[PDB]
Design a protein around this nucleic acid. Structure first.
Length: 405
RNA sequence: GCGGAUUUAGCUCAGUUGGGAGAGCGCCAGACUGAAGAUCUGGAGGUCCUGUGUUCGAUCCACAGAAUUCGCACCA
RNA sequence: GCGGAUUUAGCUCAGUUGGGAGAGCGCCAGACUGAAGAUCUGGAGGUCCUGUGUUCGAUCCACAGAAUUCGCACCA
């Protein structure tokens, strides 16, 4: 609950990704501050405001993703700040899956590192169509050559995963300095400060290079759950970015995937950053209250859609490679009925394998292809890779080949 | 997620000299007795949890994986 | 390791004329019994601790040894 959400400008989802500690989170807060300075009703957020759970404050790293809101003259933004530690890629993947564009933050003192690559690639397997780069920690370095180098590399890497690395915008800066400045004074405006001004460059880039997508409001409603909460007094809320179509209170929806069968509900709430929306539409990052569903009946990875519109998912075909005893895997074939655990991003769910006809027992080292039916619904997509582990070990590696349900 | 302990016959479990695959109970059979029970005797019964490695040789050693279990870490 | 005692049948033991290898118990069988037990019949049963020696002949005598067992290893 809180104010109403009133559409006055275009909406676009974005976020932060990059190697651990390259400063994604600092930069997130710095964006909040600076935009606020020129557009009041932009509520500012500091680090603690973002990296808020205790371990996050404890170990000093982002662990859960965070949604912050902010805007510019031109547009309104929902921004997901993701963790760069690899133990947490699943989350990063879930946030990146809501972005219409992503800010890839590369620390100039460190240059491209691993998650820098991984994130770019994963960003892609999840739909991010544009990336804008922000070469951070600049204050820490001054050899123009090391700057220029890092830039090349980043571009290159982008090229490798087919982003237009040659054209991608690359802003250099220090978010730590901008943030610090805003702390001394919150009203700094464009031109008042060097560091602060780089963020304006970033903000501009985001405004300019990442185009506003063309949402399909007419297609059947579909919104993939990204999270689920139990809100006091009201009920079960499911958050996510509408893929297409729309919703408003009163509409009944279908919770699809990751479970035996699908369940129906009527949407009784629609918000966007804790603010009422009459009807949310394709591109809104919202939250929906659902009549009757418990926290157990809805979860990340399932999907909200127009009843019957769809076949989160539970079943799918997949091309797999079973590892050799030698590669640390199994040492005995398996057959239909085998149910190990599947891992997609930060998700892990148990599933029953079903060998196609003409295939009876799959042996260690074979490249099979078969169907799996998950014990819970989850956000899938063809081409999505996964790992199969069971009994303490990794037993296979494969990719979604087609969504059964 | 962490970390501990466990995986050996159909059940419950031994098994550390790195070279023999085991005990009990059950399955059957022989002996027995009117007849059975009990006993005794014999037999059949095994991906030593899975894979790769070390080794003249692995149930045993190293490594990765899995299941179960108990303790902790998670919980709008 | 100092000395004595002991070592014969499955068990416990006799065995002194240097010439027969024994008893009791047990064990197996027969008879008897409805069967088993008890009794009667019968049968088997031996590295006389080992070796060597003395002797016409060795459980027996001599030497070496072994094993069991008991006592002994004490005085500034």
């Amino acid at each position: 609950a809180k104010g109403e959400f009133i559409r006055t400008k275009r909406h676009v989802n974005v976020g932060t990704i990059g190697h651990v500690d390259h400063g994604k989170t600092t930069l997130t807060a710095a964006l909040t501050y600076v935009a606020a300075a020129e557009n009041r009703n932009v509520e500012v957020k500091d680090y603690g405001d973002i990296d808020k759970a205790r371990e996050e404050r404890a170990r000093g790293i982002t662990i859960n993703t965070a949604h912050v809101e902010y805007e510019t003259a031109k547009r309104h933004y929902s921004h997901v700040d993701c963790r760069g530690h690899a133990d947490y890629i699943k989350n990063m993947i879930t946030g990146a899956a809501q972005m219409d564009g992503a800010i890839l933050v590369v620390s100039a003192a460190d240059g491209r590192m691993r998650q820098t690559r991984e994130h770019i690639l994963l960003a892609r397997q999840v739909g991010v169509r544009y990336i804008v780069v922000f070469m951070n920690k600049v204050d820490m370095v001054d050899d123009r050559e090391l700057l220029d180098l890092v830039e090349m590399e980043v571009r290159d890497l982008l090229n490798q995963y087919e982003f237009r690395g040659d054209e991608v915008r690359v802003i250099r800066g220090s978010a730590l300095l901008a943030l610090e400045e805003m702390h001394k004074n919150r009203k700094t405006k464009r031109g008042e400060n060097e560091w602060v001004d780089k963020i304006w460059e970033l903000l501009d880039a985001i405004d300019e290079y990442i185009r506003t997508r063309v949402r399909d409001v007419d297609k059947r409603f579909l919104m993939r759950v990204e999270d689920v909460f139990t809100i006091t007094g009201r009920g079960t809320v499911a958050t996510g970015r509408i893929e297409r179509g729309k919703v408003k209170v009163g509409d009944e929806v279908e919770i699809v995937g990751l479970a035996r069968e699908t369940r129906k509900t009527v949407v009784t709430g629609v918000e966007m950053h804790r603010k009422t929306l009459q009807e949310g539409i394709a591109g809104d990052n919202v939250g929906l209250l659902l009549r009757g569903v418990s926290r157990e009946e809805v979860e990340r990875g399932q999907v909200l859609a127009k009843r019957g519109s769809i076949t989160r998912h539970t079943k799918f075909e997949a091309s797999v490679y079973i590892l050799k005893k030698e590669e640390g895997g199994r040492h005995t074939g398996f057959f239909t009925g085998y149910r190990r655990q599947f891992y997609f991003r930060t998700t892990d769910v148990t599933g029953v394998v079903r060998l196609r006809q003409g295939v009876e027992m799959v042996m260690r080292g074979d490249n099979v292809t078969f169907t799996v039916e998950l014990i819970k619904r989850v956000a899938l997509e063809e081409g999505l890779r996964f790992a199969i582990r069971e009994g303490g070990r990794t037993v296979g590696a494969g990719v979604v080949t087609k969504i059964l349900e």
